[PDB]
Design an enzyme around this catalytic site. Sequence first.
Site, PDB file in Angstrom:
ATOM      1  N   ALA A  80       0.596  -1.017   0.165  1.00  0.00           N
ATOM      2  CA  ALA A  80       0.217  -0.547   0.044  1.00  0.00           C
ATOM      3  C   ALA A  80       1.035   1.318   0.154  1.00  0.00           C
ATOM      4  O   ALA A  80       2.131   0.947   0.795  1.00  0.00           O
ATOM      5  CB  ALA A  80      -1.109   0.405   1.123  1.00  0.00           C
ATOM      6  N   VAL A  81       0.375   2.598  -0.905  1.00  0.00           N
ATOM      7  CA  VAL A  81       0.839   3.331  -0.718  1.00  0.00           C
ATOM      8  C   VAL A  81      -0.111   4.671  -0.422  1.00  0.00           C
ATOM      9  O   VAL A  81      -0.947   4.006  -0.860  1.00  0.00           O
ATOM     10  CB  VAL A  81       1.775   3.812  -2.341  1.00  0.00           C
ATOM     11  CG1 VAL A  81       2.349   5.778  -2.335  1.00  0.00           C
ATOM     12  CG2 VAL A  81       2.544   2.994  -2.413  1.00  0.00           C
ATOM     13  N   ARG A  88       5.533   8.378  -7.390  1.00  0.00           N
ATOM     14  CA  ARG A  88       6.359   8.990  -5.409  1.00  0.00           C
ATOM     15  C   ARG A  88       7.749   7.944  -5.634  1.00  0.00           C
ATOM     16  O   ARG A  88       8.931   8.326  -5.097  1.00  0.00           O
ATOM     17  CB  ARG A  88       5.874   9.095  -4.549  1.00  0.00           C
ATOM     18  CG  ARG A  88       7.007  10.948  -3.962  1.00  0.00           C
ATOM     19  CD  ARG A  88       6.274  11.942  -4.875  1.00  0.00           C
ATOM     20  NE  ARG A  88       4.851  11.854  -4.220  1.00  0.00           N
ATOM     21  CZ  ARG A  88       4.745  13.004  -3.245  1.00  0.00           C
ATOM     22  NH1 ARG A  88       6.064  13.386  -2.073  1.00  0.00           N
ATOM     23  NH2 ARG A  88       3.816  13.729  -2.203  1.00  0.00           N
ATOM     24  N   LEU A  91       6.146   2.297  -4.341  1.00  0.00           N
ATOM     25  CA  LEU A  91       6.409   1.013  -4.721  1.00  0.00           C
ATOM     26  C   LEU A  91       7.617   0.033  -5.238  1.00  0.00           C
ATOM     27  O   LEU A  91       7.446  -0.902  -4.367  1.00  0.00           O
ATOM     28  CB  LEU A  91       4.967   0.511  -5.504  1.00  0.00           C
ATOM     29  CG  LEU A  91       4.816  -0.830  -5.344  1.00  0.00           C
ATOM     30  CD1 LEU A  91       4.106  -1.522  -4.752  1.00  0.00           C
ATOM     31  CD2 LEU A  91       3.700  -0.932  -7.014  1.00  0.00           C
ATOM     32  N   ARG A  92       8.136   1.006  -5.932  1.00  0.00           N
ATOM     33  CA  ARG A  92       9.344   0.444  -6.842  1.00  0.00           C
ATOM     34  C   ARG A  92      10.485   0.221  -5.507  1.00  0.00           C
ATOM     35  O   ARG A  92      11.428  -0.479  -5.525  1.00  0.00           O
ATOM     36  CB  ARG A  92       9.938   2.052  -7.448  1.00  0.00           C
ATOM     37  CG  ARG A  92      11.295   0.707  -8.409  1.00  0.00           C
ATOM     38  CD  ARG A  92      10.594   2.006  -9.817  1.00  0.00           C
ATOM     39  NE  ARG A  92       9.789   1.614 -11.109  1.00  0.00           N
ATOM     40  CZ  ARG A  92       9.947   0.256 -11.775  1.00  0.00           C
ATOM     41  NH1 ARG A  92      10.799  -0.891 -11.273  1.00  0.00           N
ATOM     42  NH2 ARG A  92       9.115   0.388 -12.670  1.00  0.00           N
ATOM     43  N   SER A 115      -4.610  -7.161  -6.927  1.00  0.00           N
ATOM     44  CA  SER A 115      -5.434  -6.706  -6.701  1.00  0.00           C
ATOM     45  C   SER A 115      -5.363  -6.205  -8.113  1.00  0.00           C
ATOM     46  O   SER A 115      -6.687  -5.659  -8.750  1.00  0.00           O
ATOM     47  CB  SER A 115      -5.268  -5.507  -5.486  1.00  0.00           C
ATOM     48  OG  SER A 115      -4.062  -4.370  -5.859  1.00  0.00           O
ATOM     49  N   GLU A 116      -4.669  -5.720  -9.324  1.00  0.00           N
ATOM     50  CA  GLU A 116      -4.704  -5.399 -10.953  1.00  0.00           C
ATOM     51  C   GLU A 116      -3.621  -6.526 -11.214  1.00  0.00           C
ATOM     52  O   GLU A 116      -2.566  -6.436 -11.300  1.00  0.00           O
ATOM     53  CB  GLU A 116      -4.607  -3.966 -11.027  1.00  0.00           C
ATOM     54  CG  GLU A 116      -5.275  -2.647 -10.110  1.00  0.00           C
ATOM     55  CD  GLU A 116      -4.091  -1.836 -10.358  1.00  0.00           C
ATOM     56  OE1 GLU A 116      -4.683  -1.070  -8.475  1.00  0.00           O
ATOM     57  OE2 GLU A 116      -3.528  -1.125 -10.751  1.00  0.00           O
ATOM     58  N   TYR A 120       2.375  -6.139 -11.882  1.00  0.00           N
ATOM     59  CA  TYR A 120       3.240  -6.700 -11.029  1.00  0.00           C
ATOM     60  C   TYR A 120       4.008  -7.909 -12.245  1.00  0.00           C
ATOM     61  O   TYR A 120       5.124  -7.672 -11.643  1.00  0.00           O
ATOM     62  CB  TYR A 120       2.423  -7.512  -9.880  1.00  0.00           C
ATOM     63  CG  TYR A 120       2.625  -7.225  -9.183  1.00  0.00           C
ATOM     64  CD1 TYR A 120       3.223  -6.568  -7.604  1.00  0.00           C
ATOM     65  CD2 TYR A 120       0.953  -7.113  -8.674  1.00  0.00           C
ATOM     66  CE1 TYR A 120       3.438  -6.294  -6.311  1.00  0.00           C
ATOM     67  CE2 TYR A 120       0.583  -6.040  -7.085  1.00  0.00           C
ATOM     68  CZ  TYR A 120       1.828  -5.683  -6.236  1.00  0.00           C
ATOM     69  OH  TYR A 120       1.666  -4.840  -5.315  1.00  0.00           O
ATOM     70  N   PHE A 396      -4.199 -14.659   0.354  1.00  0.00           N
ATOM     71  CA  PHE A 396      -3.116 -13.996   1.258  1.00  0.00           C
ATOM     72  C   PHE A 396      -2.738 -12.775   0.759  1.00  0.00           C
ATOM     73  O   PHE A 396      -2.344 -11.752   1.531  1.00  0.00           O
ATOM     74  CB  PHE A 396      -1.596 -14.522   1.554  1.00  0.00           C
ATOM     75  CG  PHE A 396      -0.967 -14.848   0.174  1.00  0.00           C
ATOM     76  CD1 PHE A 396       0.169 -14.585   0.712  1.00  0.00           C
ATOM     77  CD2 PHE A 396      -1.051 -15.920  -0.344  1.00  0.00           C
ATOM     78  CE1 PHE A 396       0.614 -13.632  -1.033  1.00  0.00           C
ATOM     79  CE2 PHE A 396      -0.282 -16.311  -1.153  1.00  0.00           C
ATOM     80  CZ  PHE A 396       1.126 -15.493  -1.254  1.00  0.00           C
TER      81      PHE A 396
END
Lengths: 396, 396, 396, 396
Positions: A80-81, A88, A91-92, A115-116, A120, A396
Amino acid sequence: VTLCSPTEDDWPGMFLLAAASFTDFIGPESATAWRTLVPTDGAVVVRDGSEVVGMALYMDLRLTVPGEVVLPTAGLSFVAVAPTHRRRGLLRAMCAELHRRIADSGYPVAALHASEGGIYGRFGYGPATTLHELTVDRRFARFHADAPGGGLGGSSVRLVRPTEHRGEFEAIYERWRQQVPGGLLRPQVLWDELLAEAKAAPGGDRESFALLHPDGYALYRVDRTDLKLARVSELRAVTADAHCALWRALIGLDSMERISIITHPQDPLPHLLTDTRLARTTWRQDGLWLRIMNVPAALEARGYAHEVGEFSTVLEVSDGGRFALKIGDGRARCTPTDAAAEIEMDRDVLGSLYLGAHRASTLAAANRLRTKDSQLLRRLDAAFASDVPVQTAFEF
Amino acid sequence: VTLCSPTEDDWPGMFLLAAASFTDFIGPESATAWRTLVPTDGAVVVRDGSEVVGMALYMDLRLTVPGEVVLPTAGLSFVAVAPTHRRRGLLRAMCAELHRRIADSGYPVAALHASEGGIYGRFGYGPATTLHELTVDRRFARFHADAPGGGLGGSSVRLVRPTEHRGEFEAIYERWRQQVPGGLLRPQVLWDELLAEAKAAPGGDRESFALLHPDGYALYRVDRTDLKLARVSELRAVTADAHCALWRALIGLDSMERISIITHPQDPLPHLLTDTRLARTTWRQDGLWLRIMNVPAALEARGYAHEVGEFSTVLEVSDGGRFALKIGDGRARCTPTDAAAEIEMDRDVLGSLYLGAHRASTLAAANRLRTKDSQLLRRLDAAFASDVPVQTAFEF
Amino acid sequence: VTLCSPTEDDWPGMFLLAAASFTDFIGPESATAWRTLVPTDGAVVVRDGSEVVGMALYMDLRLTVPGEVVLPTAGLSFVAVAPTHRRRGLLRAMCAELHRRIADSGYPVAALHASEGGIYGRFGYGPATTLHELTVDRRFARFHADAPGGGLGGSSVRLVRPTEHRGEFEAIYERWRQQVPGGLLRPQVLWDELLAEAKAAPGGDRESFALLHPDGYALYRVDRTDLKLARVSELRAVTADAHCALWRALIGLDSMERISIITHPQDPLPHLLTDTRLARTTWRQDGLWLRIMNVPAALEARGYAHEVGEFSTVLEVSDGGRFALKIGDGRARCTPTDAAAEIEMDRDVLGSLYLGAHRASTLAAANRLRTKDSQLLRRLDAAFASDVPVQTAFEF
Amino acid sequence: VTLCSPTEDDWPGMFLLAAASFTDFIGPESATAWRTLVPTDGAVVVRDGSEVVGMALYMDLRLTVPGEVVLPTAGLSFVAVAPTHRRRGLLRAMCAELHRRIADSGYPVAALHASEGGIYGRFGYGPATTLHELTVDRRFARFHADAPGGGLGGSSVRLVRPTEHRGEFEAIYERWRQQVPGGLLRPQVLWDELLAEAKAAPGGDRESFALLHPDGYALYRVDRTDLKLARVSELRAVTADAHCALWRALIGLDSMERISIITHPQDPLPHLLTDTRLARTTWRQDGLWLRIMNVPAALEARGYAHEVGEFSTVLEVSDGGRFALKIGDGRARCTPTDAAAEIEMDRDVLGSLYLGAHRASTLAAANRLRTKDSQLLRRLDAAFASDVPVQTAFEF
Ligand SMILES: Nc1nc(SCCCN2CCCCC2)nc2sc3c(c12)CCC3
Ligand SMILES: Nc1nc(SCCCN2CCCCC2)nc2sc3c(c12)CCC3
Ligand SMILES: Nc1nc(SCCCN2CCCCC2)nc2sc3c(c12)CCC3
Ligand SMILES: Nc1nc(SCCCN2CCCCC2)nc2sc3c(c12)CCC3
């Protein structure tokens, strides 16, 4: 903005970001249970100056792969961001840090639920199992003459309260997960969670019932709003007998018009009926995503089809190494080489072939997987295929 | 009630029963074209005392099976019993008579498209191909770096009126059907019909457009009521390049929100996108159904996987013979025997394995296919599998 | 790929691209009528090597702006790039070429109707009028005591066949378009088209009826599928009396549950009823988009509010010039200057203020329009405001 | 049936009538809080012989009007007649009694929120503010280059639990309501209520999150049934920077497909995006209704546009007096006269002009507002217009 392991005082801020980021979040005193599966140094947080604006962790999981082999697996989750810190590069930064730690800890693979389906691929994750919603109109459903467990004499299937037959479910699931690719060890705390979801909620989900066979179980509940629909949350069967017996019981739910279940594309249920079409496929998605962390350790660990004869080749993973791959007698030897590559692919594509749910021919057709020899493609296809069909254990 | 071949004066009565029995019937002056594919003694009618209360016919078709082998195939169609003569055993009488004639004419297989998945199993028909509706939300669709045909320089794809490029479509389809299991020779008269459906209808279907590549085409039209949906009626591609090029053109339909297509489960389109999930599977059904009329002639005619080593066994089809089956080097020898059966199945199950769209393991799990040796099951599985994925040609 | 004026032999290819690009295309023999409004050198085509893969044109229009002043206006339309030639910069090339020709011909403004609100800002077009769907539940609708035309004695409104009262509609529209900002001269050929849409279609639109007053008309038809809905395609009223009279007639359509109309945000209909809420706003969009081609010629041509006192300032349009703007007595003088800019904006923002449908205060709040003096903002606001409310004439 | 002020023992009967009359009633122990805003002699009840069959009350409110002037305002609410006592003239009796008390207490205006737009015109109430639901499809939403707060460096917006940042919300709202027409003082007890609605309900509303800027906040929650929709319950911004910053944060809610908000028609959000159309107006209604209790006291209290030059006229309100109105320098002088009226209107129409949300031109077009001089109409229009756009504070 800096990357740190969270301390005990960060978790309240993480739970806030969770509540705002995941619609399905189960509150903090239930997140306590999943926390037990997070190792020391399994989590990263990004603080601003300070509240948590970024988080990711992995859990310690045991994933079954073809040849009934069990791999240690980093399960990515709780990623989560904050909506205030998009684009920004958080995540990376967080994924890079966890992948460093996952690799250095000696996990051969990492896994997640998406989630999408667009986020990924660029981090080396390939969709590896397929979910399949079957909805049966059970008013028309008749079992075939050839179907097992339709003989004058006892039914072996019982209708039970889930909470009173935990040990039996645990026993059956343990046998199930050890013999099926995609299977996960389900630890005690996630059985505690599964049976707390089984009781009726005030103005929420309805009571869950269980159908129990010596060699399988089914958990089901009537839908909140559609009172003629039964949702099978989980059906685990070790023997074909148990699978058929449990479906006879579910088609016997005479107050329901439709039974729905999320299963795998090779589920034999359609073939149990006189009318294959009565079991409609109403929904399909990517299940588990796989990132091969160490290419030679993962290719060596799984079994391959005994049917294809011994063959050698050179596989290149983009920014992931080049390997002399020799497969025969359902084992693989995978060693460093600088020889010309016969077969090239991104790491995500390898994730997608690994459990044998996607055919190499199909990925090659899309140019996700380059070679100039189509004989080698047929061989990869057959080698990487899985005798036991690939299923999905639990989200999970 | 007696069974007769129709005379020229029966067809008006047959067309009446057709209009009342099939919602999609195209009127008599278009049924003239399909009639050309019906051989002398391809049709039976049941008269009452006299109006037609029952009819069935077969058409002469050339079906491509694995190993790029083309079988003569009786295509069953125009099957109907008057609503006034149900539960009278007219279908059982008509099907028995056509199967007698089909067998005696030397057709190794028969095929049909089902109006229900529950009628045709008991007459020896097994579902043999799978239809797969993919709907793409084309607003989000981005092609992968690895995808072909995304380079600065010409597009090879043209937007055209279908009626003005018949020869090119015919050429591409002819190449397509000869190299794909499920392919059918499409005769001149069904091209006449296909391009008469391509023009706009007054208060019906909209104008059909074509995307034409040297090695593939796509026919599409905007939906009647959903003006943001494009339905791809037919996409035929010989090369991976042609398939990708044609999809870049369809994702370029910027006035549309969604492109839908009926394709096969191995369609590589999802893998062409950065987000596999944007190509949702919205619908699945049995396509072509197959009845093996002569078991040894059909098993001998098709090719088998070169990967599986040579193996022998004894196959029993219920009321269909017992055969010593020996498979090696992608050929099969199938001879009469009275030796103990190792593998048993109904004739419909054989139909379902034949094009290699269903795995024997899956049918065995449902007990549609009995054996006591699971090594032989893996071998059947691999032998009967098809390198080139099974597609569906056109409904008849 | 090169940019050319089309020749007579290009138009069949243009019509093909049109049919594939616009769902609402009316066929070629009706496109003949709109062609008359395209000047010599009003059209550009992009050929590949050759079929039309790109087209754009402008039509010669007379747009009414505040102060009942009529501007020559290039109406952009028939803009299309083949789905096979996306992200190729064909739109950027075609728009640049038409804007060169539009400017060099001495058009002070250009206008268009958008298919998406995201394409046209970067080419200098600003949304300039607002569409407003009002749906009235006419079962509850009662006119206010204060409403005109509810007195014992004759109704001046007649129910008529549109085709038989063309001259009267033409007369009323001519008076309407000359006194309303957004009004367009509607030439003979578009009246020919409007009254061919008025007749019932086989399995399409229903018969159109007209309500005719000396000083206004309404064209309406019952919806295809919702038989309790009347769609008012067009209501033109010169006097408040005519507007009220026509609405009394539409609320008198006792077989209908709902009257819907696309009108402007200042339509007085809600205030004619005892219950303002019965006229629900069910839909809002940008109507006409405006590109100011020559900033000083356009600012000088329109009238300004007589209420605001005389004031001077320096306006900078990004890549569009800097001007000393002096406004008083509802006239503006706009001259070249190099003095410091007090007010800055992109050309599209000017388009949006020009007909006085958007307030400068609102665009300034979004930073579309920079100044450091808020007194000048109030003045711009009041000056550019339109006494007569801005309406939308007809889609092109 | 007689009209009385309720005693402490009437309130249980009032709460019963409330529960049966208002679907949204929040129970009696939350109605305790609103009761504090009801003055002594703010309430009337009608008893039958005895149970409460009728009730109405006003609350003491401070309404901001143009020129950042704060008026004492009687807020009508809790109006209800028992279903057993309809068409009995109980509303007419109760409203007459409260209006007597409101006037005699020296309130210049009264205000309410309507349950139907047809009841309240005949009691002198005019709709004075407009509600505007914007729904944004946030997947496509890109901010314009010209938008503030899109620069490399810190975000000033934080994601927070509402309950932990009350003082900051209170501070921002206090600044907001003092500078915006339609603003209401929100007393302590309604902040107690607002933050008790912010916690998740068992089988009701979901947890509310807050986006906090130094100069603005947004409260939002995911919808009960649509889990891809975020409802912004309240967004308050003092500076354009704060408004833009908060919208960047809401478009960053990547798990949502759509953000919906109820705002005002001049909300600048559409102009912050590259595509104005992505912010669809999905719903419009009358917000606050206004009754001018004392015409000269209210016209004198508010500010007028400094842009329009000094002008005099004679205004007649039907059964409400006749006044010499002189407006200049953004002040009005309003004195008794018997001179000929130049401008006539019902009291409700005055309510509708008062906050400057409706244009006099528009009401004149509907004949809600009679004059024979259209120059005076333009002047009224400009004078009564509000520099700062009219918003709606909170429902009472
Ligand atoms: N790993 C966890 N899972 C869950 S519920 C599974 C939802 C599946 N999603 C997964 C992603 C999207 C699709 C569907 N809850 C929690 S709480 C908590 C953890 C955690 C880690 C440590 C604190
Ligand atoms: N064979 C024919 N097909 C068609 S249209 C194909 C419809 C597919 N159905 C097929 C079954 C259900 C699903 C979908 N029309 C005609 S007319 C006419 C014939 C015939 C034979 C001789 C006179
Ligand atoms: N200008 C024309 N308009 C129309 S119908 C108006 C549709 C409105 N659209 C406009 C855009 C999107 C929204 C809605 N048809 C034709 S044919 C033909 C022309 C033309 C030019 C010369 C050949
Ligand atoms: N004034 C109150 N408001 C509310 S909630 C606001 C609902 C808005 N409606 C208002 C009308 C229709 C539209 C929407 N509750 C209560 S309880 C209680 C009072 C009161 C007064 C004294 C006891």
